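Rotation project, supervised by the postdoc (A.L.). Task for the rotation student: set up a whole-complex structure prediction and record inputs and outputs verbatim in this book. Inputs entered:
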Amino acid sequence: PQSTAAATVLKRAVELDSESRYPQALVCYQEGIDLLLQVLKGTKDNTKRCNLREKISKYMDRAENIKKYLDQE
Amino acid sequence: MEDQLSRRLAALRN
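Outputs recorded:
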């Protein structure tokens, strides 16, 4: 539900990123990460929680690189 | 864990 919308938003983030639309990609990454953090906050299972952290960390790493690039300008 | 990632998200939005 919340993970379905996170997937939708993150697919757009990756698409915008591949098109070099950096400010737009960054917002979609932030928004998708927010939703994934909301799913994580509501999850009790340790494997699911740990796997969700890996997914979030991977998207966070990409968005931190985009922000660093935009900040240089 | 959630706090570290939420801090990373807030810094991203600064």
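Student's summary: Residues 7 and 13 of chain B are 10 Å apart (CA to CA).
Supervisor addendum: Chain B touches chain A at residues 1-2, 5-6, 8-9, 12-13 (CB under 8 Å).
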